[PDB]
């Protein structure tokens, strides 16, 4: 019932974070690795997280996302996401960086708007375990940032963190609805 | 919250009729939300009536002061920090309603650094029972002063969000609270 990841789970993960959430740090940057677990199946998990186009469907404090008007999912396309987290809403406009629907993978960075400064960039790999009867998935999100430069000067990667947690809450919540009308 | 049962509805109509009801003045929005806990009300009313501990069960909050002297009566403020990332850094706010009887309190917003001018919440907590089960009903309201029209969507949708979010921690610090203290 704890959240955390068991023994189990943390070592069936390791060549995962491994591969897609080990950054290689420049001076002044931080990362940061977050999981979550989720009583609904992988595949159901997924189809959510690798909708580039709609992030607010598990995400918080999104006004809108819109893509090119014919938009073909592939990696290099953008995003502008419309944030109500800041009153006015800011822009920022996100590359896919990685998707790979074998592996479960994808990943984005913020190159415009604001933000852009930050040199933000993150990825979502999404993982099955199976036990007994039962079917669960674990997705871990991991980002690096620009550490800022300042003693308060927008430092804004605790609510970074935050939002990161509360995101993956509301992905499982979503999920976990979903898997319900299924039968 | 998931969603107010019709049973819930007709119990819920003269509570949300006294305390959740605005009058549709221009220039300002207001919104009411709901939030499903299955934990005993008067351990719901417990967290939700302590003004001067609004991080029990809000996100955001980094610090909460109140008066060197402080006693808990209608008319009292609280200065609440924020954490960084957010429209705000600080808010001040006031005590308007404590009726333990009824379990029903609020504040408004009075100054600090942020977005949301004449800012006032309602909140009231309910028994329901069914069977054998009881379980709480919380009811959130505000009204809000819009900067514009077009701008009134961003900030109801703001606002809405961390009301949404701190309800569903409420539900899960209040259900933690309950299973912690029978065993
Ligand atoms: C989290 C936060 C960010 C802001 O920009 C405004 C303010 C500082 C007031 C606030 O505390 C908002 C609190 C809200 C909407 C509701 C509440 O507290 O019941």
Redesign the interface.
Known sequence: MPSELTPEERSELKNSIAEFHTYQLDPGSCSSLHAQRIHAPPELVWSIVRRFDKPQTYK??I?SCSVEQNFEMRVGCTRDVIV??????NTSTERLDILDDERRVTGFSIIGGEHRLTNYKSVTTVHRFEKENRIWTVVLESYVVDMPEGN?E???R???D?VVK?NL?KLATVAE?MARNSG
């Not at 109500?84 to 809403?89: H, R």
């Open positions: 918080h404090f006004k109500i987290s800041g009153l006015p809403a308060s927008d430092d804004t605790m609510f970074a935050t509360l809450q609805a």
